[PDB]
């Protein structure tokens, strides 16, 4: 099927050029504005541009030629970049996810992990380690001539050699680890945010109780209603203090409630109302600030939740079929090779999968908009 590679890699060599540079510039604005995601976005954009720039020669040869029109030993230099692109993509997505989970979950451990130099060192170590991992077949040209055909490099239908274990290791370590890591990160984020919602519920209820009792005492026809409502005010104030300088305000509030209780208890009506009016100023000048702070704090954790979920979804859609098919092909070879019908059926499937998984290029810029926007 000579349609899928040309068209899809046309889209990648197209819509990829101007989005990635804008993402580069935007997260450069971010790195100068004291942030840690921008460096990872720098590395991602660099790898993206490198791979998309490797693409056009490939999109050149297939469209009109059918026998590799460049050097026979030239195609060897165009698989290393592809492998590095894919696996640096998964690595950097995993790093972003775990860093954001660490930030949202444990601020104390996140301390000294928010330093930009730490992120730069981590990125440099990741680049060096991936280069060391991908330097396997460049050193030995015999390893290249193992499974690349004499020309039109499409691997070999006789998959003979240590490939059956190379590719099994690839589908295990390279796909199954980061997927599980980010799954655990998403689970932790969800648990923390749900707990936060449960915590804010009762504080809101306590504020409601206080305001309703204040409304009741504002009239206070007799002296029994004053005490009856002030008891529930006291209980709600103690509960609200338990839920959480604001403790000083709660102390003052409880003291003034007790003052009103005593004044209404001696057998008067008006002095309790005067204390009730006095209560308003400390009600709306101490606790409302922390209430607003908690309301504002919840939304950032919600943002982090949906960022983690989007990252998981992208890493699923981009890479699962190709690695699954590689595992299937390795497992089939490891058993009885007399059944080549499996390979007959999965030939075009596996080529289609390996050509499909190129959309990290086009999906990586779009995740920047789920954090501070501007590149697109």
């Amino acid at each position, epitope marked *: 099927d000579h349609l899928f590679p040309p068209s899809l890699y046309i889209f990648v060599i197209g819509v990829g050029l101007p989005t990635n540079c804008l993402a580069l510039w935007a997260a450069y604005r971010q790195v100068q504005q004291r942030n840690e995601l921008g460096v990872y976005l720098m590395n991602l954009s660099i790898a993206n541009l490198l791979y998309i720039c490797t693409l056009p020669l490939w999109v050149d040869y297939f469209l009109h030629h059918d026998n590799w029109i460049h050097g026979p030993g030239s195609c060897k230099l165009f698989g290393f970049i592809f492998y590095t692109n894919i696996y640096i993509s998964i690595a950097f997505l995993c790093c972003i996810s775990v860093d954001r989970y660490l930030a949202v979950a444990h601020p104390l451990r996140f301390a000294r992990l928010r330093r930009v130099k730490t992120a730069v060192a981590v990125s440099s170590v990741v680049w060096a380690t991936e280069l060391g991992a991908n330097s396997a077949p460049l050193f030995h040209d015999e390893l290249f001539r193992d499974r690349y055909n004499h020309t039109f490099c499409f691997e070999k239908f006789p998959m003979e050699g240590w490939v059956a274990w190379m590719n099994l290791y690839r589908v295990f370590v390279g796909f199954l680890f980061p997927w599980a890591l980010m799954l655990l990160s998403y689970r932790g984020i969800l648990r923390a945010v749900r707990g936060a919602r449960r915590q804010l519920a009762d504080l809101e209820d306590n504020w409601e109780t206080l305001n309703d009792n204040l409304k009741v005492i504002e009239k206070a026809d007799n002296a029994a209603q004053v005490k009856d409502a002030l008891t529930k005010m006291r209980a709600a104030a*103690l509960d609200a203090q338990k839920a959480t300088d604001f403790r000083h305000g709660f102390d003052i509030l409880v003291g003034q409630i007790d003052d009103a209780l005593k004044l209404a208890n001696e057998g008067k009506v008006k002095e309790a109302q005067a204390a009730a009016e006095q209560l308003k100023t400390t009600r709306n000048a101490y606790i409302q600030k922390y209430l607003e702070r908690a309301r504002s704090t919840l939304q950032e954790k919600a943002k982090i939740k949906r960022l983690a979920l989007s990252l998981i979804a992208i890493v699923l859609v981009c890479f699962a079929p190709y690695h699954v098919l590689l595992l299937s092909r390795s497992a089939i070879y490891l058993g009885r090779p007399w059944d080549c019908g499996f390979e007959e059926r999965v030939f075009s499937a596996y080529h289609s999968s390996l050509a499909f998984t190129s959309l990290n290029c086009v999906a990586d810029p779009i995740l920047y908009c789920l954090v501070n926007e501007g590149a697109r």
Partner: antibody
Amino acid sequence: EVQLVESGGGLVQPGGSLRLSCAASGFNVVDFSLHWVRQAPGKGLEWVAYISSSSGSTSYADSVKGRFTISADTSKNTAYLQMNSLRAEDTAVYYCARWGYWPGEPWWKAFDYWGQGTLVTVSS
Amino acid sequence: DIQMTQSPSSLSASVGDRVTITCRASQSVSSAVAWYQQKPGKAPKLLIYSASSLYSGVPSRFSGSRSGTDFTLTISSLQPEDFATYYCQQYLYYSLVTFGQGTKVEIKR
């Protein structure tokens, strides 16, 4: 440690009068609030009265209003409880409690210290 | 006033057993419930304050919990000296103090 000794009385006649005295040792009554708790023969515990020497506010239970009076004397560091119009339902053992003020932990400890007990018998 | 109700009026247990006693409020008090112990002819002794918080001097086997207008006292093992009466009290404010009914623990044979 601080101790609360109850020196009251026994064997008053119906309609008689009595006065109890809850002497305190160690602490100062100007720092705490003094309550009263009584236990009927083979029954539960009940609340009687409350005073605050500092503030001056005083509160009473339903059954002991108009008949009992509580006054804490700062000079003698002793609380008091005057009993009048005694009936036979007041035959019990009377305890004197001790409760702190609101700032901080003292309020959350409750009746950390009691007395020994005094026995009042209203009989004819 | 706020009422307080204790579930078991009596309890027949042997040594080494585990015992739970529950006291229930009526108006959703805060963690303002205390547990006492009274023996024949003696003043009550405080055990737990603020729903579940151990006193300064008391054996560590006693415990408590709060679940919202629901308070529980537990003993892991009944030593021979833990056969007495127990009470629950709420102390929201000075004029609002109420006690429980009382629970007695005895021997089984």
